[PDB]
Write a protein that binds this DNA or RNA. Structure first.
Ligand SMILES: Nc1nc2c(ncn2[C@@H]2O[C@H](COP(=O)(O)OP(=O)(O)OP(=O)(O)O)[C@@H](O)[C@H]2O)c(=O)[nH]1
Ligand SMILES: [Mg+2]
Lengths: 79, 135, 50, 107, 190, 305, 42, 158, 258, 245
RNA sequence: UGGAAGUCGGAAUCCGCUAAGGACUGUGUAACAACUCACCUGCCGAAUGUACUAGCCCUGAAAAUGGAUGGCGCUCAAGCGU
């Protein structure tokens, strides 16, 4: 495009008070509306979230699984 | 090709759109009413105009009824407005007159009454062949 | 449309209004006669002003 | 000229001498050109380009999935109804729309 | 990621002289001398071994590490230019109007000039001026062939590109009108 | 004259893109809700009318540019019926005209509704409705547009054969020398190759004899089986023999290096003889450098005589 | 001399090496070992 | 005095195979009708079947031979009813072929096969029969090939 | 695109009839040991059932062929069984009685000539007599405004009944193919039709969940049979004339009587 | 790294083999040691190697493995604790480069006689020395490029012209015929593909293959064989001279 | 199919030899031929490939007097996060 030699009308970054107030009002209305939709949401939600686990690149993941196994066996023996 | 001829020097245009000129050949028409000029430019409010040797679009108002309901290409061969040639001579004819041709420039009729202008004679070789006086 | 004409066309046999050689010759005869009659009626039936 | 005259000229004389090389270099530059189009087109042209690229990406994903999957009617109808185009075919006396927006007399 | 140290290597032939001062590389060989300014790239030059030049970047990004490959290939191209040279063989073809190619050497510039006449019957005479250091001859072994030779690969290839781009067919079908001048072979003089 | 003056026929999606880009870029696109309702109605009515006008111009150009098979000479009409399916041709152009008429009807209906629309939202919905319905109408024409573009390219590449002039029509089996004769007497670039059906379409050249222009027509080869079993390639030659009042040069190869029996050549000549009524027929015995007529069987010579 | 044909015809280009700016950080034997504990852990 | 070999595909009991053949044999100096008659005489035992013919030409006379092919042998062994090709098209070879004559076809094809064993030759012929579309012992030739590979059906060695 | 002939006791195929370019939608076996097939490749074929070779190829239909019908179908379906309700003592007598019934139902002008009719999606029907006319059809049966789904000869062989997708059942003279009368009672496409043994009555089962009994001599709707909750797919009239069976999308068999 | 080369997914039938091919090769070799009484190692280097199919066909009683060198070395057993038979670890010193295993029951003299009498004329590969100078003449370019006389030769196909131009031949299209210079052999010298003693590169060898000119031969050099009865590896003539690892 | 040999189409798509090679991914022929791809081997030499997620950046639609992060101006900031 011929932007460098012949630039067009600039896009103003100077906000107006009316537009700022309107944007704030619409943001607050959207936030209240999404609260209402989340309240009346029929979409299913699990009781317990899926835990991502231990990353593979952690250098002591196998050892950490060893204490996990040992602690569960100890809990089974205690119970 | 359009009817505008090349190699034509600038001259005074004496016949604007709306003029009625005599019909100088034997096609059957008695006069031609100019509705358009070939090669006319574009200006606001300006009437198109033609001079001697120009092709115009003309309508027969008096003549045979067979020629009546059509638009014909015509060539202006005589004009009454004085115009200057390159040798410094201003000149004019006693009437405005033209001949009906086809878009390629062959004449509809067979003979021309009265003289024709030089500019018409060089620009249209059929009119030069059908003219008895070149003047 | 794609199997009739084009890069993927599969049509080989045309649709003919005749079956034999004599029918072809006759059909060409009345075809030319009808074409001439249509030209004659079209002829019987500088631009014009608006 | 008549019939397939450009193909006959192709048979007799060939291409320009650099046609294959220029075509190969253009096909090579297509990736840079597509990224330049994705980052530099403006407006409605950019929006249409984005939707087109989205559609081609979805179609390419479907083609790859089908090629990976290559190595592995509904309602009973009689024989005279087989191979024809048939519809899929899927107290409170309430209508499907029990309530709509009210329209005032001024509207 | 910022890489602590990255390095590239350029071997030098025995008859070649390399001088680097303030990133301005001068490469001299049997065929002559070439010179290029490389001060727009942050690089440290060194002599890591006899006949070996090392290029290193310290605490540079991936882009700064990758720029050393371009510097390596450019200096190797100057080395190949002063050792063996660069040669571009071009062919001009036509269908009906033979292309008349005249090659001359202008005395006051020292550069070669290639004049092209009768390109698809055109009355204009196209004139293309070669870069300084590019020599153009009309080949006698093969038919309708120009040979451009020099030390600078960029100069020779840009001259060949100018010769192609001056004979461009406009407003005609390129599947039918095949006249032009094309680069047919690229290689070394030696 | 020919049929090279037909403008290119776009596809369905290209057609929709072209029409909508004209509507987007040749008209103003900014209307405000605070304007007058007559102003809003005029804006959206102008959009609908302009879209219909562009569609009507394109469809009318497609319809008027293509040949009318009812108005052609019998040779040209039957040649188009052989090369192209005549039913498919007429159905494709009828679908084009039907879509044009339906687009006009939709435009009239939505302009009448936009006369009574009361807000910018309603006007916008009516405009989008009209444009979407026209787009659906164009979308159902996916196959006729492709078919008509292929037909247009082939028609532009067709030879120009005058059916009412002096013409020498060369016919026979393949590999007998028809294209060799046509190439030797004219300037036409018909290929000459040793395999059968080298020439798959009609070719035409021209010559001058006694200051008169003669046209010479080279045809594909014809085999010895009835009209129900001949394909379109041989139907081109058969249509040329049936409808062009010409001088038929039937080329015969008595050497039989064409691959066909001379019995089959005699039988094909006898079979296509009824097309030769009111026409002038010359058996041209070609390849005399290989085998002469005197070398042939006297019974065979008796049959040829 | 060069025995093969380069695709773009720039026969003066050298035999380039892979752009591996992280080359030399980890040895091969250690990577084989770490592959073994990685497979066991997975 | 040179030997020249030309391979062609011909339909048995048909003269018109020389139609496309004669454009090149004519320069060599043979009679196309004579070559077609020789081809028909050689392929008289292959009525209605496309077979490949070797033409050996030397000193301007030609001798013909019928080169066996697996598909032609399987279609012949199917024993289809005699029929005309012009009025009956789009046919399917859905009849049954017995495994013994499949082994016989493999023994005939042993000279063309590079398989080490008659079992491999039989499996090649079964694949060709699968491509043809017939049945072996009332079952699918792929299924008999799988049974032979698994060892349920024993193929004789040589 | 094939028709396979099976021997019942072994289960083995004797002949495979191939040559159709589409799905073979209908097959009939005539009393002169011929096999008639109709297919979606717009063709009807007559095959010799003894040798397995094609005899006739009729390619005059313009679309899919849905149903074909023989003039002797009613007697070939029931063999030696008749109105007497006793069977002959031996196999030779039973075969002789079956052949006599077939010849009586298939004689045309004193000679045995099985008459064939085919209905297609091109809105048309074709009447063929392969023995006396070969490949030239006896008549083009014309008048259905939509696809013709089912066709049947009358047991006495004088009438042809056709059911179309234009909600109509049409009656045809079986000798020259002339249209006689149109039966107009259905509001959805008629799927099947069937004749009574006395050739007075036609039962038609349609998509509108109804059966209708038509008297063909008065040309009028004798009986209306509602009761199917959904579309009717299969309709049959017993050879005894006692019962009419119907079934369809509602999954329940319905038997209808006087 | 957003800027990356786009990898082309291949919509073709055959996939990459993987480790299952290696396991199949291991099992096939380890089941073919005990069935055969000699195991030869043969070398074919810088050769097209397409006649190994005919070698396999003619030696139908033998078994030939032509696989990855290190894969065959690990199949036979490099170390004495890993070897499948007594002395197979001695044979693995010859498995370098392009080698093949030949399991046989025949007398070794028969194998040596076969591979000494086996000669096939072959196209040269890149890197070999040209034995004779090949120069295509000016004028009409023929299919063999002057190897056979032009009267018995056929003109080369017109589709090969851009390939010859890409390989460096200054050919052109004249009336559908590929010509070097002019149709009458004027204004252009003949083109020398290869000279005496020059090392051939892939461009020259591709030109020679396109013109169907063979400048090399297919020779199988036997390095040595292991005998199952003695447990001993006998070294052959190329086996003394070839480097070992 | 006039011709159709993996590559105008319809349907199947198996086996052998295998190191591996589709009853073929494209270019090509009137059909062949020829070239190319999938796959395999030799050379080389140590880390890569794919798909997502999170930051920052570009596009993700704009009219009409000349103008606005308040202005200058700012680029390891005079921008962004702590
Ligand atoms: N010896 C000889 N050969 C001829 C003669 N005329 C034609 N031929 C050969 O016959 C072959 C067929 O030539 P064409 O001109 O293509 O004849 P055609 O095939 O019937 O013509 P088309 O089918 O229309 O292309 C050519 O390849 C020639 O070699 C002739 O007069 N003498
Ligand atoms: Mg020919």
């Amino acid at each position: 495009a011929g932007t460098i030699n012949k630039p067009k009308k600039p896009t103003s970054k100077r906000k107006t008070t009316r537009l700022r107030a309107k944007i704030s009002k619409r943001a607050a209305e959207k936030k209240r509306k999404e609260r209402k939709l989340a309240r009346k949401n029929p979409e299913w939600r699990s009781k317990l979230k899926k835990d991502p686990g231990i990353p593979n690149l952690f250098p002591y993941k196998e050892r950490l699984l060893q204490q996990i196994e040992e602690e569960r066996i100890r809990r089974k023996e205690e119970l | 090709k359009r009817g505008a001829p090349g190699g034509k020097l600038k001259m005074t245009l004496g016949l604007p759109v709306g003029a009625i000129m005599n019909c100088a050949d034997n096609s059957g028409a008695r006069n031609l009413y100019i509705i358009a000029v070939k090669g006319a430019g574009a200006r606001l409010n300006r009437l198109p105009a033609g001079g001697v040797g120009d092709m115009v679009m003309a309508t027969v108002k008096k003549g045979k009824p067979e020629l009546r309901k059509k638009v014909h290409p015509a060539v202006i061969v005589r004009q009454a407005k004085p115009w200057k040639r390159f040798d410094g001579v201003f000149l004019y004819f006693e009437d405005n007159a033209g001949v009906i041709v086809n878009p390629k420039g062959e004449m509809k009729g067979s003979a021309i009454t009265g003289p024709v202008g030089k500019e018409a004679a060089e620009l249209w070789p059929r009119i030069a062949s059908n003219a008895g006086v070149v003047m | 449309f794609s199997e009739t004409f084009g890069p993927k066309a599969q049509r080989k046999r045309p649709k003919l209004s005749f079956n034999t050689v004599d029918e072809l010759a006759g059909y060409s005869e009345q075809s030319l006669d009808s074409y001439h009659a249509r030209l004659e009626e079209k002829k019987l039936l500088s631009v014009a002003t608006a | 000229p008549q019939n397939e005259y450009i193909e006959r000229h192709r048979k007799l004389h060939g291409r320009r001498l650099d046609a294959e090389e220029r075509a190969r270099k253009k096909a090579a530059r297509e990736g840079h050109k597509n990224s330049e189009n994705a980052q530099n087109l403006r407006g409605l042209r950019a929006k249409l380009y984005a939707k087109q690229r989205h559609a081609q990406k979805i179609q390419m994903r479907k083609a790859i999935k089908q090629h990976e999957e290559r190595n592995v009617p509904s309602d009973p109808i009689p024989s005279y109804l087989l191979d024809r185009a048939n519809p899929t075919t899927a107290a409170r006396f309430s209508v499907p729309i029990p309530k709509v927006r009210g329209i005032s007399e001024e509207e | 990621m910022r890489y602590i140290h990255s390095e590239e290597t350029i071997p030098v032939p025995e008859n070649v002289k390399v001088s680097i001062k303030s990133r301005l590389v001068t490469v001299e060989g049997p065929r002559g001398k070439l010179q290029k300014d490389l001060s727009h790239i942050a690089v440290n030059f060194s002599v890591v071994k006899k006949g070996v030049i090392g290029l290193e970047i310290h605490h540079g990004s991936r882009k700064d590490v990758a720029a050393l490959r371009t510097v390596r290939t450019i200096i190797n191209n100057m080395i190949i230019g002063v050792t063996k040279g660069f040669k571009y063989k071009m062919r001009y073809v036509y269908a009906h109007f033979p292309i008349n190619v005249n090659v001359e050497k202008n005395a006051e510039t020292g550069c070669y000039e290639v004049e092209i006449r009768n390109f698809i019957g055109e009355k204009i005479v196209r004139k293309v001026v070669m870069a300084p250091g590019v020599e153009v001859e009309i080949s006698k072994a093969q038919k309708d062939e120009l040979i451009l030779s020099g030390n600078s690969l960029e100069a020779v290839s840009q001259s060949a590109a100018d010769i192609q781009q001056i004979c461009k067919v406009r407003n005609k079908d390129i599947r039918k009108f095949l006249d032009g001048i094309y680069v047919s072979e690229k290689g070394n003089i030696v | 004259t020919g049929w090279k003056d037909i403008p290119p026929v776009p596809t369905a999606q290209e057609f929709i893109d072209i029409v909508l880009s004209r509507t987007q870029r040749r008209l103003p696109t900014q209307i405000r809700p605070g304007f007058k309702i007559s102003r809003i109605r005029a804006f959206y009515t102008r959009k609908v009318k302009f879209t219909q006008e562009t569609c009507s111009e394109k469809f009318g150009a497609i319809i008027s540019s293509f040949p009318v098979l009812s108005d052609q000479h019998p040779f040209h009409r039957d040649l188009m019926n052989i090369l192209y399916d005549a039913d498919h041709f007429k159905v494709a152009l009828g679908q084009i005209s039907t879509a044009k008429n339906l687009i006009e009807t939709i435009s009239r209906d939505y302009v009448r509704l936009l006369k009574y629309a009361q807000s910018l939202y309603q006007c916008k919905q009516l405009k989008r409705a009209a444009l979407g319905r026209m787009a659906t109408l164009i979308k159902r024409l996916k196959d006729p547009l492709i078919y008509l573009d292929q037909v247009r390219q082939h028609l532009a590449r067709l030879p120009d054969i005058n059916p009412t002039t002096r013409t020498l029509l060369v016919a026979g089996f393949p590999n007998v020398g028809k294209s060799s004769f046509v190439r030797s007497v004219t300037r036409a670039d018909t290929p000459v190759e040793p395999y059968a059906f080298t020439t798959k379409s009609l070719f035409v050249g021209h010559l001058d004899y006694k200051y008169l222009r003669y046209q010479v027509i080279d045809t594909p080869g014809i085999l010895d089986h009835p009209l129900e079993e001949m394909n379109t390639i041989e139907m081109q030659s058969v249509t040329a023999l049936a409808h062009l009042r010409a001088a038929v040069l039937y080329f015969m190869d008595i050497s039989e290096q064409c691959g066909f029996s001379l019995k089959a050549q005699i039988n094909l000549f006898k079979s296509i003889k009824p097309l030769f009524a009111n026409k002038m027929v010359f058996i041209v015995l070609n390849k005399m450098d290989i085998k002469k007529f005197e070398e042939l069987d006297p019974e065979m010579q008796q049959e040829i005589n | 001399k060069n025995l093969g044909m380069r695709k773009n015809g720039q026969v003066w280009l050298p035999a380039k090496k892979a752009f591996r700016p992280t080359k030399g950080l980890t040895s091969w034997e250690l990577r084989v070992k770490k592959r073994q504990e990685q497979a066991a852990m997975k | 005095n040179e030997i020249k070999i030309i391979h062609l595909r011909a339909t048995g009991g048909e003269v018109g195979a020389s139609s496309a053949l004669a454009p090149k044999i004519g320069p060599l100096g043979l009679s196309p009708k004579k070559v077609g008659e020789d081809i028909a005489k050689a392929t008289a035992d292959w009525k209605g079947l496309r077979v490949t013919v070797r033409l050996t030409i030397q000193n301007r006379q030609a001798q013909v031979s019928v080169v066996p092919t697996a598909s032609a042998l399987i279609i012949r062994a199917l024993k289809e009813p005699p029929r005309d090709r012009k009025k009956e098209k789009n046919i399917k070879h859905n009849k049954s072929v017995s495994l013994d004559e499949i082994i016989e076809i493999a023994r005939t094809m042993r000279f063309k096969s590079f398989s080490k064993d008659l079992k491999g030759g039989v499996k090649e012929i079964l694949g060709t029969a699968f491509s043809v579309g017939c049945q072996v012992d009332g079952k699918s030739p792929k299924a008999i090939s799988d049974a032979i590979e698994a060892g349920e059906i024993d193929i004789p060695d040589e | 695109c094939t028709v396979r002939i099976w021997l019942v006791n072994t289960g083995r195929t004797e002949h495979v009839l191939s040559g159709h370019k589409g799905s073979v939608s209908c097959v009939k076996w005539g009393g002169t040991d011929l096999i008639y097939t109709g297919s979606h490749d717009r063709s009807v074929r007559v095959w010799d059932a003894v040798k397995g070779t094609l005899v006739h190829n009729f390619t005059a239909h313009g679309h899919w062929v849905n149903h074909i019908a023989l003039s002797s179908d009613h007697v070939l379906r029931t063999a030696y069984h008749d109105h007497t309700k006793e069977v002959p003592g031996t196999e030779e007598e039973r075969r002789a009685k079956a052949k006599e019934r077939f010849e009586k139902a298939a004689k045309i002008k004193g000679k045995v000539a099985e008459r064939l009719v085919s209905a297609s999606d091109d809105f048309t029907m074709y009447l063929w007599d392969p023995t006396n006319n070969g490949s030239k059809p006896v008549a083009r049966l014309l008048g259905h405004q939509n696809k013709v789904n089912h066709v049947q000869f009358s047991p006495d062989g004088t009438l042809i009944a056709s059911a179309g997708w234009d909600n109509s059942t049409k009656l045809w003279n079986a000798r020259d193919g002339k249209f006689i009368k149109n039966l107009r009672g259905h509001v959805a496409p008629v799927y099947q039709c069937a004749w009574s043994a006395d050739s007075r009555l036609v039962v038609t089962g349609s998509k509108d969940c109804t059966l209708k009994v038509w008297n063909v001599r008065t040309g009028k709707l004798a009986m209306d049979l509602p009761g199917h909750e959904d579309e009717v797919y299969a309709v049959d009239w017993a050879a005894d004339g006692e019962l009419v069976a119907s079934g369809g999308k509602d999954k329940a068999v319905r038997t209808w009587r006087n | 790294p957003k800027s990356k080369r786009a990898r082309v997914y291949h919509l073709t039938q055959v996939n990459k083999k993987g480790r299952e091919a290696k396991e199949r090769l291991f099992s096939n070799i380890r089941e073919t040691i005990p069935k055969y009484q000699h195991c030869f190692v043969f070398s074919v280097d810088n050769m097209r190697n397409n006649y190994l199919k005919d070698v396999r066909h003619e030696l139908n009683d033998c078994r030939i493995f032509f696989g990855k060198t290190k894969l065959m070395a690990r199949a036979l057993g490099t170390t004495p604790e890993e070897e499948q038979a007594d002395g197979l670890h001695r044979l693995t010193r010859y498995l370098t480069g392009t080698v093949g295993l030949l399991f046989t029951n025949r007398d070794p003299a028969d194998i040596e006689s076969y591979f000494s009498n086996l000669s096939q004329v072959d196209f040269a590969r890149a890197g070999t020395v040209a034995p004779r100078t090949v120069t295509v003449p000016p004028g009409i370019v023929y299919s063999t490029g002057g190897e056979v006389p032009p009267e018995h030769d056929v003109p080369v196909s017109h589709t090969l012209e851009p390939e010859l131009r890409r390989l460096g031949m200054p050919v052109r299209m004249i009336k559908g015929k590929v010509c070097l210079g002019d149709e009458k052999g004027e204004a252009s010298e003949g083109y020398t593909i290869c000279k005496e003693g020059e090392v051939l590169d892939s461009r020259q060898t591709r030109l020679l293959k396109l013109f169907s000119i063979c400048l090399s031969e297919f020779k199988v050099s036997l390095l040595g064989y292991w005998s199952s009865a003695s447990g001993e590896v006998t070294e052959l003539e190329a086996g003394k001279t070839r480097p070992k690892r």
